[PDB]
């Protein structure tokens, strides 16, 4: 449980360390106090143990599980391919695509913690409670996850 | 009345090989029957995942972290990927058949598990069960065998 939180952080760090330098797009949302049941209902059920390796395999481009969001519930990957509400806010830079607007939209509609890897640039970003943090370093991503989840 | 576990299993396997065979994506999938596969499951990466054709496909995409080794199904879950199975020590195995096939055949000597393979060389779908090896099944043949065995 404390060790489960450290495995969660390590899984996310391994996945983003693989995907970011390969510019593999990724979108991962973690449930907090507000249920994500309605978005989980839109995805393919996995109910899978969390590991960096499984997160990488999910997001490999042009594969059946890659398109849409992974939603983490507790210590399980609940689903992949979930459809998240887009943000209609105009303050979103033009260069930020669908994945980023999906993450931002969920962070305006829930207290879920979402991170993105850009398929255009490999930039790592976080969307949480209406704040959007662009282009984190891997070390910064890790310490932010640790502070939030450990 | 929703689709039974057995119907979902058959559909998952059929969808997966239907995708991997034409693409010549190698695959190795073993299903536990009455004899526990616990010692082989211990060698794999824990997934404990719901069975879907989509997940099986994503596991075996070439040059990915989960694609090497065997997937082992236990009950209605994908227990592990990347598992090690016993390689067949037999010498009456054609030189056409590589290590995935020898692993499938080996496990079918050591247990009553049902294993199927997709060849990365030809895309051929094959089954290894109770020491017998059935090469190059059609998709229809594969499905009917799965139904006769699992339903
Ligand atoms: N003992 C084994 N059990 C399960 N899979 C294996 C085993 N040995 C090799 N493989 C896999 O068989 C495939 C072909 O092996 P190779 O011909 O050595 O490239 C690769 O995915 C290997 O990881
Ligand atoms: Cl980003
Ligand atoms: Cl930073």
B35 touches chain A (CB under 8 A): no
Min Cα separation A90/chain B (Å): 36
In chain B, residues with a C-beta closer than 8 Å to the C-beta of A47 are: 48-50
| Chain A: closest CA distance from residue B79 (Å) | 9
Spatial distance between the Cα atoms of B103 and B141, rounded to a whole number of angstroms = 22
Q: Which residue of B has its CA nearest to A48?
A: B49
CB-neighbour burial class of residue B14 (10 A; exposed 0-12, middle 13-18, buried 19+): middle
Q: What is the DSSP string of A58-109?
A: HHSTTSTT-SSEEEEETTEEEEEEE-PPPP--S-S-TT--HHHHHHHHHHHH
Instruction: Tell me the shortest Cα–Cα distance from B67 to chain A, in angstroms.
Output: 9
Which of B50, B58, B67 comes nearest A58 by C-beta? B58
Beta-bridged to residue B105, according to DSSP, are: none
Contact between B123 and B21 (Cβ < 8 Å): yes
Spatial separation of the C-alpha atoms in residues B81 and A55, rounded to whole Å: 13
Q: DSSP 3-state helix, strand, coil percentages of chain B (rounded to 5)?
A: 35, 25, 40
Q: Is B85 in the pocket of ligand 1 (CB under 6 A)?
A: yes
Does the CB atom of residue B84 touch ligand 1 within 6 A? Answer: yes
Are the CB atoms for A82 and A117 separated by under 8 Å? no
Q: Which two tokens stand for residue A133?
A: 């943090």
Resolution in A: 1.9
| Interface mutation target, options B54, B57, B72, chain A, most CBs of A under 10 Å | B54
In 3D space, the residue among A74, A62, A72, A64 whose CA is nearest the CA of residue A15 turns out to be A72
Name the 3-class secondary structure at B26. Answer: coil
Q: Is B122 in the pocket of ligand 1 (CB under 6 A)?
A: no
Confirm whether residue A68 is marked as ligand binding: yes
Pairwise CA distance, residues B62 & B19, whole Å: 13
Give the number of the ligand closest to the Cα of residue A124.
Answer: 2
């Amino acid at each position: 449980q404390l060790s489960d939180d450290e495995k969660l952080v390590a899984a996310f760090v391994k996945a983003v360390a693989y995907m970011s330098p390969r510019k593999i797009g990724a979108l991962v949302s973690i449930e907090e106090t507000q249920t994500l049941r309605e978005y989980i209902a839109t995805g393919i059920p996995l109910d899978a143990d969390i590991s960096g390796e499984l997160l990488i395999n999910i997001f490999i481009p042009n594969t059946p599980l890659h398109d849409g969001a992974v939603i983490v519930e507790g210590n399980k990957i609940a689903v992949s391919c979930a459809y998240l509400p887009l943000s209609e806010s105009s303050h979103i830079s033009k260069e930020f695509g669908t994945r980023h607007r999906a993450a931002i939209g969920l962070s305006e509609a829930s207290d879920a913690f979402t991170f993105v890897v850009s398929e255009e640039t490999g930039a790592i970003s976080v969307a949480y409670k209406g704040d959007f943090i662009h282009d984190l370093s891997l070390e910064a991503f890790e310490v932010l996850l640790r502070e939030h989840f450990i």
